[PDB]
Design a binder for this molecule. Structure first.
Ligand code: FES
Ligand code: NA
Ligand code: NA
Length: 98
């Protein structure tokens, strides 16, 4: 199924949908909502975001440790939505300065 993702970016709030079988980064990009990234493989911190509400499957990621995951951080390049979500983007620095 598809879920509606509310992206709270550094340039306002944007509404985009994403198939539960695809990554949020790719879905966002085709709907013209540019998000940060670099490796696009789940092993770095560039695409870091924070889950405000909703369920996701970000098990394909590998950079974030359990402490960061518990704090709701997710890497959008490898994150599947599992319900409607409200996500804050461009959180790499926040993550870095925890
Ligand atoms: S762009 Fe590197 S983990 Fe997402
Ligand atoms: Na960019
Ligand atoms: Na450092």
């Amino acid at each position: 199924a598809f879920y509606n993702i509310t992206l709270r970016t550094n340039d306002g709030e944007k509404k985009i949908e994403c198939n539960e079988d695809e990554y949020i980064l790719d879905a966002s990009e085709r709907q013209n909502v540019e998000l940060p990234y670099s490796c696009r493989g789940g092993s770095c911190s560039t695409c870091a975001a924070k889950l405000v509400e909703g369920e996701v499957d970000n098990d394909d990621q590998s950079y974030l440790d359990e402490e960061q995951i518990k704090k709701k951080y997710i890497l959008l390049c490898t994150c599947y939505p599992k319900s409607d979500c409200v996500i804050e983007t461009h959180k790499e620095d926040e993550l870095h300065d925890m």
